[PDB]
């Protein structure tokens, strides 16, 4: 199917408690494969998936060089943004950045991404054209001017269409037994009375990969969006994910309700009912 690679950088200032922390993690789809943390006793790029371990010393050395350089650059950037917003030196602030490439089911580039935030709000993003920027406010417009002057977009584009795709394809091959395996949800419906005249039906999905899934309840074939309690998809810790969706129904009407499950790992969507 379709696949993506993303890197997630977080740089966080903490006045009075040392220099800002820089952390980078890398993902292919929902599988993390590297980390770097400037607060580690000996900061270095570390493997987080078995299939990346085969990369040679030069790979790890280059990654670590890059992340050490970024640690310093992002510290300067934090300083710069504090000034752009006329902020005091007292507060803690965060730059986040997420970038990477999406491939279609043929392995071809679908599109690239390179987006940044400041204190959790959109700051600047590379447009889908990989050539122009969208700045969120007059501060980010300063960054935009700087990056336009230095032709930064051209360099980001070169990476996103080149090395990004090339490495993602390599990772997909090296990790093909896991990265290219969809594990379907294991499903069941539970029933608990909430009183004499109502009961909760809960539709479960467990053990699935990747995390993308759709779980819905219908009553008489009609979507029950407003009446359904849906929890956030959550990681099990063994690579797989879990989710449930619950509806409270009048006692005696249980068979009018159906749970529908869509997942990459399923040929055809499932329809489930409570089975007393």
């Amino acid at each position: 199917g379709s696949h993506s690679m993303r890197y997630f950088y977080t740089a966080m200032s903490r006045p009075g408690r040392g220099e800002p922390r820089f952390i980078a993690v890398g993902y292919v789809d929902d599988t993390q494969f590297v980390r770097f943390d400037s607060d580690a006793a000996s900061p270095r790029t570390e493997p987080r998936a078995p299939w990346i371990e085969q990369e040679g010393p030069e790979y790890w050395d280059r990654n670590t060089q890059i992340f050490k350089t970024n640690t310093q650059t992002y510290r300067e950037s934090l300083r710069n943004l504090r000034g752009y917003y006329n902020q005091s030196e007292a507060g803690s602030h965060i730059i986040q950045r997420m970038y990477g490439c999406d491939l279609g089911p043929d392995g071809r580039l679908l599109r690239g991404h390179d987006q940044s935030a400041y204190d959790g709000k959109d700051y600047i993003a590379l447009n889908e054209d990989l050539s122009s920027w969208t700045a969120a406010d007059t501060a980010a417009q300063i960054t935009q001017r700087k990056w336009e002057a230095a032709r930064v977009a051209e360099q980001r584009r070169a990476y996103l269409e080149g090395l990004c795709v090339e490495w993602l394809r390599r990772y997909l091959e090296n990790g093909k037994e896991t990265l290219q395996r969809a594990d379907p949800p294991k499903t069941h419906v539970t029933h608990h009375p909430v009183s004499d005249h109502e009961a909760t039906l809960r539709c479960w999905a467990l053990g699935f990969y990747p995390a993308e899934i759709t779980l819905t309840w219908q009553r008489d074939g009609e979507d029950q969006t407003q009446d359904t309690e849906l929890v956030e998809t959550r990681p099990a810790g063994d690579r797989t994910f879990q989710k449930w969706a619950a509806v409270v129904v009048p006692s005696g009407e249980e068979q009018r309700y159906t749970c529908h499950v869509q997942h990459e790992g399923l040929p055809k969507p499932l329809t489930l009912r409570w089975e007393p």
Partner: peptide, 11 residues
Amino acid sequence: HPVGQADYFEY
């Protein structure tokens, strides 16, 4: 693999 030189310029 992360991007390298394209990340040289500060914000």
